[PDB]
Amino acid sequence: GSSGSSGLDYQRLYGTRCFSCDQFIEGEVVSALGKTYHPDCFVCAVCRLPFPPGDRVTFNGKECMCQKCSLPVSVSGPSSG
């Protein structure tokens, strides 16, 4: 638990920080390409959807896209803000 914290040195520990938003990943971390990212940060760049544990993932420079997006869709256009 957390009771009786005098200072903030314990942090010194390795500590896993997301290489996306630059924030400590509490609970669980997603190890990808020998790095650390959040469960919501390591998502598509267009639709921003979480890649399934099965389907494949396309690699585009820095950001990745989902099969759905990567592939041609009958209905395409600008996404919400």
The answer to whether 64 is a known ligand-binding residue is no
Q: Is 41 annotated among the ligand-binding residues? A: yes
Considering CB under 5 A, how many residues would be counted as binding Zn ion? Answer: 10
- Among residue numbers 36 through 55, which ones bind Zn ion (CB under 5 A)? 38, 41, 44, 46-47
The residue among 16 and 41 lying less far from Zn ion, judged by its C-beta, is 41
Cα separations in angstroms, 60 against 9, 38, 57, 66: 39, 19, 10, 10
The structure tokens 């099969």 sit at 67
Q: Residue 74 in 3-state DSSP?
A: coil
Of the pair 1, 78, the CB lying nearest Zn ion is at 78
